[PDB]
Amino acid sequence: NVESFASMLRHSPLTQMGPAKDKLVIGRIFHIVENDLYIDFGGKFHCVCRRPEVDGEKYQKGTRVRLRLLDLELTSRFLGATTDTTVLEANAVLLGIQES
Amino acid sequence: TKFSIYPPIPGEESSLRWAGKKFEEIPIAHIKASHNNTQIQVVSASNEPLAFASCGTEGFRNAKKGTGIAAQTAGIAAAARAKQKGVIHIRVVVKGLGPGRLSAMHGLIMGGLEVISITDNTPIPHXGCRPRKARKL
Amino acid sequence: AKHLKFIARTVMVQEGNVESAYRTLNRILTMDGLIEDIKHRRYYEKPCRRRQRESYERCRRIYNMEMARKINFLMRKNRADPWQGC
Amino acid sequence: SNEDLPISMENPYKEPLKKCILCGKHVDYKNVQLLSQFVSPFTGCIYGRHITGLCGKKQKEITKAIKRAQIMGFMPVTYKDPAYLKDPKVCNIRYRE
Amino acid sequence: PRQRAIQWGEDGRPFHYLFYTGKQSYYSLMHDVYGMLLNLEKHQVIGSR
Amino acid sequence: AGSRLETVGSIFSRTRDLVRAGVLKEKPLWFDVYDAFPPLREPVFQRPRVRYGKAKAPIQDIWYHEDRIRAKFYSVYGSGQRAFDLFNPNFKSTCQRFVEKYTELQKLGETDEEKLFVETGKALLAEGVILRRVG
RNA sequence: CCCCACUAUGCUUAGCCCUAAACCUCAACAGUUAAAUCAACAAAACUGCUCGCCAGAACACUACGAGCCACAGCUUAAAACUCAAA
Numbered sequence A: 001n002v003e004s005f006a007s008m009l010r011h012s013p014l015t016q017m018g019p020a021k022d023k024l025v026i027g028r029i030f031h032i033v034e035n036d037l038y039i040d041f042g043g044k045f046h047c048v049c050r051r052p053e054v055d056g057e058k059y060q061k062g063t064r065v066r067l068r069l070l071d072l073e074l075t076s077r078f079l080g081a082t083t084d085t086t087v088l089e090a091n092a093v094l095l096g097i098q099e100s
Numbered sequence B: 001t002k003f004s005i006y007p008p009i010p011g012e013e014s015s016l017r018w019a020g021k022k023f024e025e026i027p028i029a030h031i032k033a034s035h036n037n038t039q040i041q042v043v044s045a046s047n048e049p050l051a052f053a054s055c056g057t058e059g060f061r062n063a064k065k066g067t068g069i070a071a072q073t074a075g076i077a078a079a080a081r082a083k084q085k086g087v088i089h090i091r092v093v094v095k096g097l098g099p100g101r102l103s104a105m106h107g108l109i110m111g112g113l114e115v116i117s118i119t120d121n122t123p124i125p126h127x128g129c130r131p132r133k134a135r136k137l
Numbered sequence C: 001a002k003h004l005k006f007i008a009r010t011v012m013v014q015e016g017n018v019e020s021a022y023r024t025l026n027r028i029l030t031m032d033g034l035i036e037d038i039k040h041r042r043y044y045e046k047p048c049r050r051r052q053r054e055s056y057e058r059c060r061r062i063y064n065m066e067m068a069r070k071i072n073f074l075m076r077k078n079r080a081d082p083w084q085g086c
Numbered sequence D: 001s002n003e004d005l006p007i008s009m010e011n012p013y014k015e016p017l018k019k020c021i022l023c024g025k026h027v028d029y030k031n032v033q034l035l036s037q038f039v040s041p042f043t044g045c046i047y048g049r050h051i052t053g054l055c056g057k058k059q060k061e062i063t064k065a066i067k068r069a070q071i072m073g074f075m076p077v078t079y080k081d082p083a084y085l086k087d088p089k090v091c092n093i094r095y096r097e
Numbered sequence E: 001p002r003q004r005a006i007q008w009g010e011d012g013r014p015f016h017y018l019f020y021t022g023k024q025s026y027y028s029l030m031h032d033v034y035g036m037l038l039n040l041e042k043h044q045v046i047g048s049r
Numbered sequence F: 001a002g003s004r005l006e007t008v009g010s011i012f013s014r015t016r017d018l019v020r021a022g023v024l025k026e027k028p029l030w031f032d033v034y035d036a037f038p039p040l041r042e043p044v045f046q047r048p049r050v051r052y053g054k055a056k057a058p059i060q061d062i063w064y065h066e067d068r069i070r071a072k073f074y075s076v077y078g079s080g081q082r083a084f085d086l087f088n089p090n091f092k093s094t095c096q097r098f099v100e101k102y103t104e105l106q107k108l109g110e111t112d113e114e115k116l117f118v119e120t121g122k123a124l125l126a127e128g129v130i131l132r133r134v135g
Numbered sequence G: 001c002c003c004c005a006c007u008a009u010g011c012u013u014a015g016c017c018c019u020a021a022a023c024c025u026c027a028a029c030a031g032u033u034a035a036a037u038c039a040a041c042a043a044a045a046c047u048g049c050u051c052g053c054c055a056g057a058a059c060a061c062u063a064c065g066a067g068c069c070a071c072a073g074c075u076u077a078a079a080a081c082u083c084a085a086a
């Protein structure tokens, strides 16, 4: 009675979410560069969001935040290209901080 | 009220006035800015001629007629003859892309006239006569 | 000739600023393509020449729009180096 | 075999295709109010689909309607009828100052 | 002139884990500095040239 | 003596053959391991070609029966104001809670779709769930 | 070449003439994307089938013959001498 991969995939939260456009997700700040926050939210690629002007100092490494997802991976095919160009990051909008 | 660049439409009731005269009653300065000359005629709203000036009538000849300073001088001359006849506010109707297109308007202002509107009436045929063949230069 | 006058291509002057009124008129005629049209009509452009220029202009616009899109897309990573030293 | 395997079907999350503002509406040459929304106020020039946002089919219907209305005596050619200047601006063109 | 010592033993195994970079001393220094910058984050002129 | 023709066969075949011909005096350290435990595919260079005409990749879109229920729920009620926590492997969203109730009621014999969807919303409201219709 | 003037002509009608870098310089139809991807460039590489066409350059969009409302015309289209290239 070993769970199969097909079973893990069917019942995974990322599978259950459906499309990522306009979906609220909880992310975690793991790396900071000046006012650039690198946030992991459970997907393949992280998103990079600028530090909000209000309560900017509350955003530190490990701080959990709320995001509105737009794309799990930013990719586009440009004219004269056989494949897609990817920037290796997700597109998301930082809304604020998640608190209990 | 906010400013509208769209001219007042005749027959409608606008509040705009210039010396007690409506837009339909303001005289018209007709500027023909050609490639080698500039002609300016001021007429009344009833199509009565009031003043005429061109770069040629101001003593410019050959390539000197096709200059901005020549058109500016022609505007001043037409403004002077028009101001004597009682013209202050004018509607500018310019046809052509010659060098005296903008300079001719400056001369009208320096001559004492107030421009309340600018209208382009450069003839554009919608399909018309075949223009002369291209030049090999 | 048969239309009403002082409606088409007519801009009103504000506060005696005739320079700004003329610039607005010129911008109107430029955006509608009349200035380029009048210029091209001074001498007759032959049909084979018009098609060649129209084809070149349509392909240049496509290439310029496509090159702008690529730069916009590839400028997201212009942020500071996150892993400096590695 | 296995219940958790994927199943073949059509995309359930697919979004509908985009539609132009005039998709599903009759374009008549007598409706000069509608036609006037797609011509230049200063020059009467018909706007390209990159300005009107219309699809190929409605861009064509609008163009044919304007041309018919103009020469039949319903619509001016050299300018937008001033009566229709305060109608909703649906065209992506910025002109004044 | 100072001579670099052997970079491997008799068995042929290089001593330094960054040997195959060709710049093991330079990249070992960058590796040490990059690691220190990380630990600080986890924790948090006139007379010299 | 060796072979750098990386596009002719594989490192195993090129090494095996030169060993037989006596070109290589000794076998490389990895040869005996590769022989005992070879990879599933022999690593031979191939040039990726582009598909043309009626050739299409065999990869299939991954869909599930419940995805139809998810599309309707997002259309009717939108995305829940509750935030997904994709780090928790056992996270359940409002849609997933809706899907499970919708599945339970279907197994009770109900077969209508429009009726099976309205009864599901009522059950969750009874349980205290917030379902704000988008329109 | 540049500037001005003006004619045949561009237009309509009724007849002719039948030529274009008449060119996506891509014959029609059918099929394939796996092989080796493929001289180069153009426009990814081929298969089946059929018609038309080609066989060093130049002579030659020529000569003669023939047909044609064409009569300084068009279509079809060589040979001799010449070269080792084109």
Ligand code: FES
Residues within 6 Å of the ligand: D018, D019, D020, D022, D023, D024, D054, D055, D056, D057, D058
């Ligand atoms: S999008 Fe449907 S008619 Fe324009």
Ligand SMILES: [K+]
Residues within 6 Å of the ligand: G023
């Ligand atoms: K061609």
Ligand SMILES: [Mg+2]
Residues within 6 Å of the ligand: none
């Ligand atoms: Mg004649």
Ligand SMILES: [Mg+2]
Residues within 6 Å of the ligand: G022
């Ligand atoms: Mg042709």
Ligand SMILES: [Mg+2]
Residues within 6 Å of the ligand: G027, G028, G051
């Ligand atoms: Mg054929």
Ligand SMILES: [Mg+2]
Residues within 6 Å of the ligand: G057
């Ligand atoms: Mg030959």
Ligand SMILES: [Mg+2]
Residues within 6 Å of the ligand: G061
């Ligand atoms: Mg010939």
Ligand SMILES: [Mg+2]
Residues within 6 Å of the ligand: none
């Ligand atoms: Mg002949």
Ligand SMILES: [Mg+2]
Residues within 6 Å of the ligand: none
């Ligand atoms: Mg003959």
